[PDB]
Amino acid sequence: MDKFRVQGPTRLQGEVTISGAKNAALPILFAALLAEEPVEIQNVPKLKDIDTTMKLLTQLGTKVERXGSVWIDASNVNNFSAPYDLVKTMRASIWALGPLVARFGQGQVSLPGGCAIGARPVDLHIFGLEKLGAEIKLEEGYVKASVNGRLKGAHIVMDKVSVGATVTIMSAATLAEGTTIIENAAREPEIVDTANFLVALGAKISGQGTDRITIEGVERLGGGVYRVLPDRIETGTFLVAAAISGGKIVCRNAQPDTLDAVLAKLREAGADIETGEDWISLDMHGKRPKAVTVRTAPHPAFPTDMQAQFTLLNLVAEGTGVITETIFENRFMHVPELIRMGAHAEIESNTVICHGVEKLSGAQVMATDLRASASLVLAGCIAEGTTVVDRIYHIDRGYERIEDKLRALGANIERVKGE
Amino acid sequence: MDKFRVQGPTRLQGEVTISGAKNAALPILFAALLAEEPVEIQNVPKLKDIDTTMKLLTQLGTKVERXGSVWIDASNVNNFSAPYDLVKTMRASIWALGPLVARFGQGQVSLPGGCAIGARPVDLHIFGLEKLGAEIKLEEGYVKASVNGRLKGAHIVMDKVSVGATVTIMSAATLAEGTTIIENAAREPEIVDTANFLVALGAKISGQGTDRITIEGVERLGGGVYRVLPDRIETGTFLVAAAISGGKIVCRNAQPDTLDAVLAKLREAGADIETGEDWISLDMHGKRPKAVTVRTAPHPAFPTDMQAQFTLLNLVAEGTGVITETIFENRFMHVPELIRMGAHAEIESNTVICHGVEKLSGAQVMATDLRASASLVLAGCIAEGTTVVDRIYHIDRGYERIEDKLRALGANIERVKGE
Amino acid sequence: MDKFRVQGPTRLQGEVTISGAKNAALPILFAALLAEEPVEIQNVPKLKDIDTTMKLLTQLGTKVERXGSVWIDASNVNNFSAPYDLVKTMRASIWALGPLVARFGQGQVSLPGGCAIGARPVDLHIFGLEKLGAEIKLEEGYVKASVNGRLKGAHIVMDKVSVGATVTIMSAATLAEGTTIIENAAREPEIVDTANFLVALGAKISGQGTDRITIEGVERLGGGVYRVLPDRIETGTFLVAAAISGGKIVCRNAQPDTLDAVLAKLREAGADIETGEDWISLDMHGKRPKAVTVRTAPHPAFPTDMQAQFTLLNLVAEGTGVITETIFENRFMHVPELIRMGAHAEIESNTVICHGVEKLSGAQVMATDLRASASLVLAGCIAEGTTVVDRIYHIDRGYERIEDKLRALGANIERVKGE
Amino acid sequence: MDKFRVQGPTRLQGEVTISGAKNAALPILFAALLAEEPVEIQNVPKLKDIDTTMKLLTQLGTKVERXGSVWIDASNVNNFSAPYDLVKTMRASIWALGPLVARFGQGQVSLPGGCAIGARPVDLHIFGLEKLGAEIKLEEGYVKASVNGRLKGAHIVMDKVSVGATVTIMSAATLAEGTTIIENAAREPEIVDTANFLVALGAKISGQGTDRITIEGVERLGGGVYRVLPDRIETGTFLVAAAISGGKIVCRNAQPDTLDAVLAKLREAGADIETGEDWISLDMHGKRPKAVTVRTAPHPAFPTDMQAQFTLLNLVAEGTGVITETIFENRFMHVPELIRMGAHAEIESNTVICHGVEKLSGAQVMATDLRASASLVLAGCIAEGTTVVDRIYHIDRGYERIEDKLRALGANIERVKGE
Ligand SMILES: CN(C(=O)c1cc(OS(=O)(=O)c2ccc3ccccc3c2)ccc1NS(=O)(=O)c1ccc2ccccc2c1)[C@@H](CC(=O)O)C(=O)O
Ligand SMILES: CN(C(=O)c1cc(OS(=O)(=O)c2ccc3ccccc3c2)ccc1NS(=O)(=O)c1ccc2ccccc2c1)[C@@H](CC(=O)O)C(=O)O
Ligand SMILES: CN(C(=O)c1cc(OS(=O)(=O)c2ccc3ccccc3c2)ccc1NS(=O)(=O)c1ccc2ccccc2c1)[C@@H](CC(=O)O)C(=O)O
Ligand SMILES: CN(C(=O)c1cc(OS(=O)(=O)c2ccc3ccccc3c2)ccc1NS(=O)(=O)c1ccc2ccccc2c1)[C@@H](CC(=O)O)C(=O)O
């Protein structure tokens, strides 16, 4: 069981190049199944799910190869059944369903085998595809979706805002006959990037980023080159890394417009921020951060995926600040780990009251949440002494070489084996 | 477009005989598809959905004939497809699916509708049957279900409490091999009555009325006689009719234990209530009702289907009272119509604050909700002058000729044609 | 009972001058009690609540006079008890409490009678003042806040985001000793305007418009001239008026940056929009609006107060659009009224599915909600025939001479008496 | 910092005598302030809050002595101010306010007051007494209340169901002039016990245990003897101890009717249960428990205070079960700790998916929640090896001699000092 042994305190400053967001690459890679001609997807990080996706595609007959980018030739996809073995490892597998039925008339993917009925997020995808006119067969724990001829554009009203369903329906719609309208579509920048990728390939899509996306089905999609957008959460993580340690950092290969809320919130924390076309710099001028009030909400509002990091910011800030989770629940579990490092905080409902302290103290900590865990690593970097963050594989699955990037900013960090 | 013209004010008093609840008759009638020998279902109201149901059953090869009861012979069901032009008219149609698959190994019900993903009742039925071992198929606008051998008893966890799915799973489970357990099962009296009907036919069910139902599949179900339970909402409607007009009334053919919450609430209003084995009496002794506090909640708590009527009660009562709806979002379309009749009320979220007035004024009103509409008719009976309630067909589908019953209580009411 | 008789259809085009938002005038007027020298508040609409406010202030010993602006001389306030008869008429009465205690060490106001322990929004104002160090007295259905010397700065965490309390706490804090921090502060433009008015008088406030306001108490506040911000809701009502009638309009004396969400949404409807420093223009080029998907949320997201109007826009638009209300659970009481005029819509929870028609029909309609009512008047303007909107006094309280501004845009409208 | 060192695995079996519920004793003890003649309160556990309450009562001039019971002579209460250092230690202190004002016309309690406006739980107590006619004064960080003559019975609507406020209002009302009606009152068994205690002293109360309580004020309350009801949560803890260890146990001095939902839930888990008039027996017949579905809700439904215990039951049971919390969003802090002991579970919102494992492994764990912590000691008892539960003072506050009771069932447990 790998883990991170950190030594603090260390001022984190310098530069970092932001990787491509896997949250955007994943939906794009599966969207690539629609491409009749070769596609070069640039700026894809090297993470477990990317490997898994490449294997799954290859086992569907698509020629795949990578490096900084992943090259895809889906001109000859001839197998339409996603193998259980690869599918079981990730939520993104479901995305191979829509493209296959839309382009080849058939797709089969295994489904989770819980016990609860009317919840399985996967159900929206199945119904979304049925709305587009796919015949659906639910048997032996899987879904076999198919259609005779092309799918038909439909007017779809999403009851729940779903990032996953938005991608399935939008991707499938690009090859349907007619127009598809998705009301209450997920607005995430990653949706926008997937929309833009499909457009780059010849699709007709507008309204991405808003509450309703409109797709005008076309005969087929070509190929080409497309660059995955920067990881806005990785960016936030590092901006907070500088913001909580009196440092100054510049994030390269970044996209400022996906972080209006986070940037504004850092300024309120007292950060001196400048942005360029593809970079963001943050300077604390050696000062401690000033406590802020945070309210997580749907994009473009403050992102829940930046919450654990700002919680940490407040715990080491000047004053008191309350982080409110307006949407999710049981989201402050990493907080007791921070308290063990000396932080002063009270959890009350969907709220955590933060009382900044001078310095945190090294301790042995662990967090199952990816972001909560990265927060524990930044905490270790500015804590007095030695901090040991366990089960860091959660971080490895979402961040590309975080230790190398942190070390380059001044952190004393070492990965270790043996449980 | 039929409508009711009412002349008020009148003190509603006398007696009324409560009809059988169509909400229990419908699920029972479809459950009868499992009966191998003749069944006599007594106390069935004469309402539109009952006719449609009788036509649908006949279309499937079952011998149907009615009057006060419906005599069913499903010994020879030989067609397992519920035609689209018989299904599109009512939700209850879906209940033919489970019984056909369970008894004959196959079935299909036309699937009307269109929009709304995620929240598409029927989804629950589909997965319930699949969990019981059936292979689902969605094609040609049909929901199709088949199974090899009998359905397999299964332990099912209902994510959302659902009356419709509870009926489908419970009914279908009676003929499955093994035990079926339904967690978080609908608790309504109509579920309980359906369970009892099935038990009357030879089924093994226990727990009906609670969070979890347990069914022990048997070889086959026989026949017999069963009386549909009284319509608790119709009963509540007439008790309120008297409670808000200083009247006295006795409801015959009633079942008191399905109304603890409603009767308790009326006493709080100052009603003097008496109950028997099969009757309930209410006397206001000429007094205005006293304002009450109401909170709709899951059965056995106060029923949301009695909410509109109690809003009326508070609006003509002594004092201020607050109606709280913890079940339906926007279930207050009756409030604006009442205000035009001179009622003083403020809507504040899932709440309506009521300021009882001495009297209401006749006015032209209309409401699409069945219960809100019935309440407008009552409002007209006690309002000064002439009231015209339009689109009363909403009432006709759920109440067995409410105008005759009301008139016997003293009301001056006329059904009129011409838009 | 006054009402509007409207003759349709008429294309609404031309120009309109936007009045000041009474929603910002009210809090500012009461804030003026803190001014030690004369204050000229410009751009104040002539509405019922403004008259009441001027009367109330006069009863406290302030010299008040008005026209386009209101003059306030609070240098000699000598009576610190807001009279019941003037206070009972409007919610804004509560805003006289904080200033009186903060500047004179005492203020007394009557409170809403009844029950609903826990509901009352005035509680937040009371407890807010208590945190600032005020001695509170709750007797005989009213409040007495008093302080010996000055109030003291405090760190306050708002559990509920409250426009009213934010104003009370923020205003009173301007004269307190030390720093006050309000977390989870209301972010509305009107709060921002009040903050700026206070600042103009010498207060030290920052963060207005964000989740946390910070105030630095000062010895005293001076006087001056301040102009109330444009009514962003009146503005939106008029943009929609043009947007649903193939019209073209220019809104003068407007403030574009308070409507980012509304302007964007109108563009999605197909409106051609250009804005300037103090004006906004909208041109449909004789086209019907295209249906839009709307999700009301907290400012700066799409405003719930524009919801009724956009519902109307969709109902006459091309296509289907759903309006989800994440805010006010209930808020579609206007829909039924629009249906009677021929609109096709379905209410599904906190949602209304709209199916645009080409032409609405005149009818007799009424709505208690201010915005809903103004929508009916707009509906009547584009409807075929005659429309009669009753109970227009609701509109008269929130709109300054709406009939005069509509007529100038070409509407055929006239006010009528006799119930 | 004391802590428990546990040796597993051991089969917990035998008998345990259930203590009085401190949750009933506390409200009863303060209610005893209304007694004019000596009162013997039997079956009171020996816990920190009881000692604190006895000291506080003593300060007020009440003669107090104790052992199994707490004898009270409040005939001579002559000081009506609960001192700050004597109040700051527990929430129950607020219960001294109402009786003092009701019986002596005056009282004041020191106030906590940190942040959280419109969320401070003492507000309801305050507004409650005000509805009863008391003058409220907030100053000196005290809540002073007084009344002219007696309190006046009022009709009070509770917006939030509140255990604490229900007690303050109900208790104070026993001496008010006229009738008091509490709508939406807390229904807990501890409320009912407090009602019966007051009735035992001569009070007139009815409806306790339901939605609305009605109190008819009397001249004065006398003295006597009353036995505090058994700790239903403690009972539940022990039944789970046997149920998760293949054990058999008999709980003496118990009250079965306060645990309907818990007992039913245990039967579903496979427990063989028998109950008597004052005892409950549970037998697993050496078998593992079966996984169950649990949804916490308001009493009489499944209690949130038994939730951590049942989470543990599922985690060592046969199969998968999802635990749902609709009361306390973060009542899951025990899972991370249980996973560390080898359990397999996933948290998802107000839910925790549990996958039972054959046996758990000892580890070092700690939980701040009283119940979560007691569950860790149970996990320790059936865990393989040696478990150490830190900061067990949380358990000491709410359970009387848990070690001694656990030891007598067969556990290997030892308390240890030194951090
Ligand atoms: C994001 N979502 C998911 O569960 C999710 C994550 C996936 O994979 S990722 O990690 O590459 C990814 C991709 C795009 C993202 C965009 C914005 C933010 C985060 C992202 C993460 C891929 C699909 C997803 N959603 S889904 O409806 O097809 C889906 C598919 C299969 C599942 C199987 C078991 C349980 C849940 C499942 C959900 C949830 C996350 C949550 O539960 O808070 C949601 O709320 O929308
Ligand atoms: C009850 N439910 C339904 O929509 C419902 C009503 C039906 O028929 S009834 O009128 O004979 C009936 C039967 C039992 C009742 C018990 C308590 C209260 C009212 C009842 C009414 C029969 C099935 C229903 N639900 S369902 O999931 O299979 C179902 C089936 C087919 C559908 C087709 C299109 C749209 C919705 C559908 C819902 C709704 C009722 C509502 O929305 O107010 C619910 O939310 O629970
Ligand atoms: C705005 N608010 C109110 O209830 C409200 C309205 C007032 O008056 S107005 O009409 O001149 C006005 C002023 C400023 C505004 C700024 C942005 C948006 C709308 C505005 C309207 C003045 C004060 C208010 N809020 S309050 O907490 O002191 C308050 C005070 C006394 C009350 C008495 C009975 C019932 C509710 C009350 C609320 C509510 C409105 C609601 O949600 O129903 C809220 O959103 O919190
Ligand atoms: C019980 N209640 C409390 O927060 C609570 C607990 C107290 O003390 S105990 O531990 O001896 C106790 C007594 C009776 C119980 C009955 C059923 C279940 C648990 C119980 C626990 C004593 C008073 C309480 N509530 S209160 O409104 O006067 C109160 C009083 C003073 C406070 C000071 C600071 C912060 C919060 C406070 C809350 C809450 C518990 C919850 O939030 O779930 C409620 O259900 O309303």
Side-chain angles (χ1 to χ4, degrees), chain A residues 22-24 26-27 49 90-95 112 120-122 124-125 161-165 168 188 190-191 232 305 328 397, chain D residues 348:
Chain A
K22 110 198 190 299
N23 298 340
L26 286 172
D49 293 322
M90 56 169 189
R91 295 187 186 200
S93 307
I94 190 62
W95 287 324
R120 213 58 59 172
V122 135
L124 301 173
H125 301 245
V161 175
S162 171
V163 165
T168 291
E188 274 84 355
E190 293 77 10
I191 292 300
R232 66 206 167 89
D305 285 340
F328 296 65
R397 174 277 316 175
Chain D
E348 201 101 319

Side-chain angles (χ1 to χ4, degrees), chain D residues 229-253:
Chain D
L229 106 172
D231 189 330
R232 66 205 167 88
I233 301 306
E234 187 195 28
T235 298
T237 296
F238 288 110
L239 294 176
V240 172
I244 70 177
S245 68
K248 169 184 168 184
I249 193 177
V250 176
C251 294
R252 302 294 179 180
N253 286 352

Side-chain angles (χ1 to χ4, degrees), chain A residues 6 54 72 87 96 104 121 132 136 143 190 193 219 231 244 246 270 273 285 287 327 367 369 393:
Chain A
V6 185
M54 283 183 298
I72 296 288
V87 166
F104 308 93
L132 291 172
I136 303 296
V143 175
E190 293 77 10
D193 209 47
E219 284 300 304
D231 191 330
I244 65 176
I273 295 167
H285 295 299
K287 298 172 297 76
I327 40 192
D369 178 71
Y393 68 85

Side-chain angles (χ1 to χ4, degrees), chain B residues 76-249:
Chain B
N76 257 274
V77 163
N78 55 36
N79 167 41
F80 316 133
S81 187
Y84 169 79
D85 74 305
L86 287 178
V87 164
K88 71 178 171 185
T89 73
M90 59 166 186
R91 294 176 164 165
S93 293
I94 190 59
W95 287 323
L97 183 62
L100 291 167
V101 69
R103 182 175 174 204
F104 305 97
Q106 77 191 78
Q108 69 184 55
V109 169
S110 178
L111 212 184
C115 296
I117 288 297
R120 197 267 293 266
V122 148
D123 293 5
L124 285 169
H125 305 237
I126 294 183
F127 294 131
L129 289 181
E130 167 176 54
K131 293 299 170 187
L132 280 181
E135 177 203 74
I136 301 301
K137 186 63 176 190
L138 305 178
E139 72 202 359
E140 304 173 296
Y142 270 94
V143 192
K144 308 183 179 190
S146 60
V147 61
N148 259 261
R150 300 187 246 167
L151 289 168
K152 286 69 175 163
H155 189 141
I156 307 168
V157 176
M158 289 291 103
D159 193 273
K160 309 177 296 187
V161 179
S162 182
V163 162
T166 300
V167 165
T168 289
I169 298 164
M170 177 178 63
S171 300
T174 63
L175 289 186
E177 272 168 3
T179 292
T180 288
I181 299 178
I182 303 167
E183 307 270 1
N184 192 44
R187 304 174 65 183
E188 279 75 356
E190 296 75 23
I191 290 308
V192 176
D193 202 52
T194 304
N196 294 339
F197 165 73
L198 292 164
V199 175
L201 299 177
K204 283 173 182 165
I205 300 167
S206 82
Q208 57 265 42
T210 76
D211 281 342
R212 65 143 60 175
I213 306 184
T214 304
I215 306 88
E216 248 282 287
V218 292
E219 289 297 314
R220 51 147 251 158
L221 298 182
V225 187
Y226 189 88
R227 197 187 159 86
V228 161
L229 93 166
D231 192 329
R232 58 197 169 104
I233 310 309
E234 188 192 30
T235 301
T237 305
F238 288 105
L239 296 169
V240 175
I244 71 172
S245 58
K248 180 194 169 64
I249 192 184

Side-chain angles (χ1 to χ4, degrees), chain A residues 183 212 293 295 320 322, chain C residues 183-184 212 293 295 320 322:
Chain A
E183 304 221 39
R212 79 149 56 181
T293 307
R295 296 187 70 72
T320 289
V322 185
Chain C
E183 313 222 27
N184 296 308
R212 74 148 60 184
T293 295
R295 263 189 171 290
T320 281
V322 182

Side-chain angles (χ1 to χ4, degrees), chain D residues 22-23 26 91-92 94-95 112 121-122 125 162-164 188 190 232 328 397:
Chain D
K22 113 180 186 307
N23 295 340
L26 292 169
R91 317 160 99 179
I94 191 50
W95 287 322
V122 192
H125 293 265
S162 173
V163 172
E188 271 80 353
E190 295 76 22
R232 66 205 167 88
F328 287 123
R397 181 276 302 187

